[PDB]
């Protein structure tokens, strides 16, 4: 029995669009918290595309700002055309669209997420980590990785650790395989499991060329690496680049705060939230508890604990989780959920005392 | 009470004008190139279409050209759009896996179609309101619109809880006359999958809904992969369809997980029936499989893991040789789902794989 997640680095193509999109946002929210944002980014071969509608009383540069992000991993002026076609403007709340979401969690993890997410997560972070401090040389931001675990026994195997680096031409390959065998092994020992599972190292031969170069990257193609990997449903909403008043993303951090608190406080092993949204409507037009039979009281006294123990408004539940006062990009890369590097609002336990209370304790 | 909510999209909405460009370029390299290797992205930002990413074919190709014969049986002229290309166009044993990445198959049998009730309603609902925009039934509208069919589950029976729809009218409409269509399209929807009448209907909550599709908006290839796949019934592991030819695994394995989650509930093994599939750079085979049945197995799930395996071949070059997939037009797959298409002729829906499941 087999479950693999993927994650990628701040060098890969779609996710330098999700980071450009968010840094739009965050550059917007600085100036302006009422700002209507909804930026995407097609990055193909060396045209770069900023595209999307803004509401704002913000000074921002689209270009400059993607160009910030850019830098960093690091081209430079000579290597990008980058252009707009956004919409810039001036000047309860409802669900400004149709569209379901998932929250979700589970106990397998300290972080309340599937090891095969936090893993593959881990693995790019520290990679990227030793990129910055030169403890790995030779390597450049563009990078995956796969981390494949075998549930069979009661205890979880990894099956495979995969993993692809943008290197040098001119690396030493001992040198780069050592390296990565030696983080592969030190993420495995953190959580603390097997540590004879196969590697496969850039299995792909050379990867040199990276980012958009050969390629291309748009907004929200890594829907399921920004989510669950995907252990969870998903409703087919990409998050960056959109203001809380986009209910696919303020909806979907509001169902991981119910999903992870449920879960802290001991109500259940793994919990799912589904919810859909009206045009108009300021509350979830349809709500949906999934425990996968692992509820420790009954599924019954939690759908009553969720219900009294969270508002379902819009506006009050973006306020709670302070989305207007939040910096997006740091979520742009590595996950949006059980970021225990970060400091969300939807992943803070402060609904556990109340949950406990409210199914009657 | 427990409600599973799924949507649909027009051929007008901006993300599925794009996946419609991406699989039309496709199609147009396949046609005149078995060999063509594709991987075609579009932008629609408000006035401009960019159409990109990587192809590799002997076919004469105008993409640009391809993009206004879909753009222009939705309604707009040579005047409503620039639509420019920064695609990278060229020329030239075993297919190994040329990506990473998870794939799932889902079934259940709660449809003809072997698909999510919600789904198939969401799906069957815009279908049907296109048809009568194309045949002049239904007058003052236009091909951006989206579905949201929310259903109850709770009794033995399900219950349609809400239907929602959401339709580009033009600015001189008749109210009346458009809730009088609609309404009587759900009622009809309902009635041919003999479901309750009484559920709540919402029609164009927003209000005015005249300007659409890429106008004052944005469309990407691939952002209506739950559309495409099972409604949020299914896992998806995070790949779009639209504008990749069948060796890009994200695609072929996605169908061929399908076909073998379809003739499984088809066999009577389960009611429900999902597949993990996992891929590794150069791996011939699916580097890991996962078999789901929801405790909804007729048989050991073990015996069915067995009759899979013997089966079907997992070598991914025989697969999609199998399911004709050089062969295969994907245009009319990028609208309304993937799965599923009783309306269609797809390889990865037929159910020829039964009488080898039962053996096994």
Not at 115 to 142: G, M, N, P, W, Y
Not at 175 to 184: D, E, G, L, Q, T
Not at 335 to 341: A, E, M, T, V
């Amino acid at each position: 029995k087999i479950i693999t997640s993927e994650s990628v680095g701040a060098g890969h193509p779609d996710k330098i669009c999700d980071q450009i999109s968010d840094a739009i946002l965050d550059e917007c929210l600085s100036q302006d918290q009422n700002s209507r944002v909804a930026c995407e980014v097609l990055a193909c071969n060396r045209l770069i595309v900023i595209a999307g509608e803004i509401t704002t009383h913000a000074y921002v540069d689209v270009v400059k700002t993607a160009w910030e992000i850019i830098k960093p991993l690091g081209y430079d002026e000579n290597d990008f055309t980058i252009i707009s076609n956004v919409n810039k403007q001036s000047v309860l709340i409802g669900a400004g669209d149709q569209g379901i979401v998932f929250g979700y969690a589970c106990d397998e993890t300290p972080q309340y997420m599937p090891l095969t997410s936090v893993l593959a997560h881990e693995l790019l972070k520290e990679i990227e980590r030793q990129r910055r401090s030169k403890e790995f040389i030779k390597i450049q931001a563009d990078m995956k990785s796969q981390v494949s675990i075998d549930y069979s026994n009661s205890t979880p195997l990894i099956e495979t650790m995969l993993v692809s680096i943008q290197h040098d031409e001119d690396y030493d390959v001992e040198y780069f395989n050592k390296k990565v065998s030696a983080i592969m092994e030190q993420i495995a020992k953190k959580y603390n499991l097997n540590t004879n599972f196969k590697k496969i190292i850039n299995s792909s031969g050379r990867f040199v060329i990276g980012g958009p170069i050969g390629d291309t990257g748009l907004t929200g193609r890594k829907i399921i690496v920004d989510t669950y990997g995907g252990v969870g449903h998903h409703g087919g909403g990409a998050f960056s680049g959109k203001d809380p008043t986009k209910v696919d993303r303020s909806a979907s951090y509001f169902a991981r705060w119910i999903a992870k608190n449920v879960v802290a406080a001991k109500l259940a092993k793994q919990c799912e939230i589904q919810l859909a949204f009206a045009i108009g409507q300021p509350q979830p037009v349809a709500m949906y508890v999934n425990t996968f039979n692992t509820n420790l009281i009954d599924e019954t006294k939690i759908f009553e604990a969720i219900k009294k123990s969270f508002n379902f408004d819009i506006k009050t539940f973006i306020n709670d989780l302070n989305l207007w006062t939040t910096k997006y990009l740091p979520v742009a890369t590595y996950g949006h959920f059980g970021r225990d590097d970060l400091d969300l609002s939807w992943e803070k336990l402060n609904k556990v005392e109340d949950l406990i209370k409210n199914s009657k304790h």
